[PDB]
Amino acid sequence: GHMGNAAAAKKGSEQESVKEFLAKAKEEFLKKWESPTAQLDHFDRIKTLGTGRVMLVKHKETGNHYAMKILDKQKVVKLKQIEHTLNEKRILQAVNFPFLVKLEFSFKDNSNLYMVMEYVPGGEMFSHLRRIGRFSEPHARFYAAQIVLTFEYLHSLDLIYRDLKPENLLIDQQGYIQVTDFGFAKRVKGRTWTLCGTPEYLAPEIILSKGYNKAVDWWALGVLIYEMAAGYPPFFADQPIQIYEKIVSGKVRFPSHFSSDLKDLLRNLLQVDLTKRFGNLKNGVNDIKNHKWFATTDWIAIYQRKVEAPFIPKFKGPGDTSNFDDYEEEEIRVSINEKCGKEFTEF
């Protein structure tokens, strides 16, 4: 076979240890999910880090810096995102993994919801990728391995992520990934039906209005790996309708510099037929983790953050924002009347 005896036994034992880890992780998640913190004037607002908004803030008492997500309650209602916003908070407060951003505080006022997270100062993967053009395959593989482990963790908890893209992956001071933006994350045992995500990253079954499952995240991983290694995603067009048509055809073309191992992995992730898509088969995540393209990946060493990162962002101080682009600053206005109190009682 492909593995000799010693290798097969080591791999089997490793896979059983993963099961043991995940069983303990589920116990811990459920305890927090069942038995789950500040106010605005506790923070100085420094600078906007991203919009869609997230601000760098400094906690007055401790001087610690954080990234504070601010959501307008009225906008959340009008856009039908109430449940999604409750999902984001509940999931973030209950999960624990080295590549998932940590939520430190949450609160609300008359106008807004607030989620205060660890500040990840290295910037978005998106910026670095657009600046350099493309990542070499080893560099892309280092990031991809972190996403594979993160999805193995989330999916074991019956959590679907639903918004993988370089814009949502932050680089920390050691060069490792922090996944942010859990607004579409959801506890899903089997199928779910909401049409949501980002066009270039949507699996065909989402676009086709089918009940879909966690395999949409594995499709999105294929899009991410392609984009990291090529510099642009596999289904690329100026308008969403054109993007959707390319996705549903499923025809993928690869740059001539992609290795055959990479193309094979991507054909198995960017697989329209769910009976054939890696991550959706009997062998589960192991079809991905044991693929030839990942043969050099030490999964435990990645988890332990002991692999030397390909890139370490420059950091000049705890509140430095040099790795982030600039955005228009809008003052945070808080109405004298409570808005949408009933809708957000559980937040």
Binding site: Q81, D163, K165, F184, T198, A237, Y244
Partner: peptide, 13 residues
């Protein structure tokens, strides 16, 4: 030709 800037999520198609 395609989108090179930051891509926003969609809530419905």
């Amino acid at each position: 030709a395609g989108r090179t800037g930051r891509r926003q999520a969609i809530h419905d198609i």
